[PDB]
Amino acid sequence: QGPSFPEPKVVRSQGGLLSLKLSATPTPLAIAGQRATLLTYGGSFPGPTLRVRPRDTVRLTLENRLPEPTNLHWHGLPISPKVDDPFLEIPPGESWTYEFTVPKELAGTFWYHPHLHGRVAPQLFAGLLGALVVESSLDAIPELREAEEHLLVLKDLALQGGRPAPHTPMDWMNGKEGDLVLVNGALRPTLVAQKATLRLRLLNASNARYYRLALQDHPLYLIAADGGFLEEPLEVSELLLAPGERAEVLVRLRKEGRFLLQALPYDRGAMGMMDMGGMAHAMPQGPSRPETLLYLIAPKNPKPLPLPKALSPFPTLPAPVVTRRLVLTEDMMAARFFINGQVFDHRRVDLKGQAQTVEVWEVENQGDMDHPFHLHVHPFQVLSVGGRPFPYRAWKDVVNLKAGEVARLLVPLREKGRTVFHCHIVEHEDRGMMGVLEVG
Ligand SMILES: [Cu+2]
Numbered sequence: 001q002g003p004s005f006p007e008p009k010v011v012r013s014q015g016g017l018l019s020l021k022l023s024a025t026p027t028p029l030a031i032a033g034q035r036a037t038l039l040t041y042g043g044s045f046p047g048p049t050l051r052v053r054p055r056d057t058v059r060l061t062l063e064n065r066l067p068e069p070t071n072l073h074w075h076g077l078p079i080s081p082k083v084d085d086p087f088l089e090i091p092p093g094e095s096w097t098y099e100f101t102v103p104k105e106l107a108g109t110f111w112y113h114p115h116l117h118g119r120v121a122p123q124l125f126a127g128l129l130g131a132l133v134v135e136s137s138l139d140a141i142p143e144l145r146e147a148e149e150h151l152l153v154l155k156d157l158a159l160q161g162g163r164p165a166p167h168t169p170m171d172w173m174n175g176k177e178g179d180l181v182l183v184n185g186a187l188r189p190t191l192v193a194q195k196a197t198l199r200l201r202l203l204n205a206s207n208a209r210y211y212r213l214a215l216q217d218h219p220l221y222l223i224a225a226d227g228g229f230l231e232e233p234l235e236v237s238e239l240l241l242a243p244g245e246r247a248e249v250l251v252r253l254r255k256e257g258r259f260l261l262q263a264l265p266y267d268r269g270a271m272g273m274m275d276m277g278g279m280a281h282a283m284p285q286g287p288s289r290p291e292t293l294l295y296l297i298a299p300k301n302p303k304p305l306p307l308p309k310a311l312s313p314f315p316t317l318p319a320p321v322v323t324r325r326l327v328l329t330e331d332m333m334a335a336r337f338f339i340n341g342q343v344f345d346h347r348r349v350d351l352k353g354q355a356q357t358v359e360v361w362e363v364e365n366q367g368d369m370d371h372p373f374h375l376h377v378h379p380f381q382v383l384s385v386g387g388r389p390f391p392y393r394a395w396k397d398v399v400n401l402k403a404g405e406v407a408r409l410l411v412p413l414r415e416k417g418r419t420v421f422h423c424h425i426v427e428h429e430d431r432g433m434m435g436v437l438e439v440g
C-alpha cells in the first residue's frame, strides 16, 4: 500500500515460536540494474528479517546449499555459546537447527551471518546476512508507536562477471569495500515518508566500510545502540556506524522537501599502494568519498511527534572482579593481525573467566587502522575511550577503536562455555585477530 521502499521480507514469531527453515544457496538476482549470482539466505539479499518478542522460542534450521562449509553467528544475542557456536561447521548439503529462547529484557536490532573461521569475509561479502529484531514493550508508548518504522541494512558490494568480486591481496590487509553502496540491497532508493516522525533501525553489515551517517538539514535522535535502548534520546548531528554496529534513531521531519541521507567522508586508516610520485603523505588511502545512501521525501505539512522523555534505565552493574588487557597489533604487509601478539588458534584458550562475575576489559588499539572490537555472547558497557567518558549508557557488542585508542569495557559474564572475541573488519578476523574466552 502506498509508496514502496525496498526492505527485507519479515518473518514473525507466532504463539511464542519462530520456526523457519533457511537455506544458504547461490541465487541469481536483480541488483542495481544488473543480474548477479550472490550467496543468500532464503533466496534474498539481504536475508529475511526475523522478528520476535522476549521469551519467544527460535528454531532456525540452516540448510547448507553452498559449495563450502558454513555456520551462523547470532550477532549480539546473549544466548548460550553452545547454540551460538563459533566452532561448528555445517558441511555442504547438511543442516543444523539452532534453538534458543529470547532473553526477557532484550530489545533492539541484531543480525545473523556466517562465522566459519577462514571463510567469513568471502561469505559475508557474497550476500549471507540478515537482521533480527526483538520487539519491546517500549514500542507501545505513543511517541514510538506512531513513528514510521523502517529497517536500513547498510551493505556495499562489488561485482565482477556477475558474481561477487574476489578478494585481492589488498582486501586482506584493508578489508574489502565495494563500489556499489546499497541500502536493503538497493542503490539509492527513495523513502517517501507517510509520517513526520521516523524510527530507523540501522545495521552496518559491510565487511569493512564505515558509514559516517548524516541527514541533510536534520539531526538524528539516537534511542538504541547495538544491544538495547539508551536511557533517553540523545541528539546527534551525525552518527558513525562501524562494521557490525547497529543503532536506532528517530528522525523528526520539520519541513517538506527531499533530503539526502549520506555517508560523509571518513578516514579509517586504510593503506594504499604507491608507484608514480608527486604528492605529500600518499601512502594512506585517506577519507572515503561521500556517498548518497537514500533520498528521504517528507510528507506534506509535516508535524512530528514529541520525543519520548525517557526510554530504558540501564541496570547498575556490580563492581568488577578482574581487569584484562587486550592489545591489538598488525603487520600490514603480511596482512596478519594479532591480539596480545598472537594469531587465532581454535585449540588455544586465551582468557578464562567466571560465570556470574563482572570484568573490566581494556582493549588497546596499537595499530594504525580503526579496528571494531566484537565480543560474542556477552554484551558489555563501554565506560570510556581514550580516558574520556562514553556519551551514553546502553548495551553494546561492538566498539570502534581508532589508532591508539584504549577502551575500558564492563563485561558481565553470563552463559558458561567457550566463545570468541575478534575484530569485525571480517578480513582481519580471517587473518588473525580473534581469541578465545572460556567462561566457567
Ligand atoms: Cu557479527
Ligand SMILES: [Cu+2]
Binding pocket: 337, 370, 371, 372, 423, 424, 425, 428, 429, 433
Ligand atoms: Cu581489524
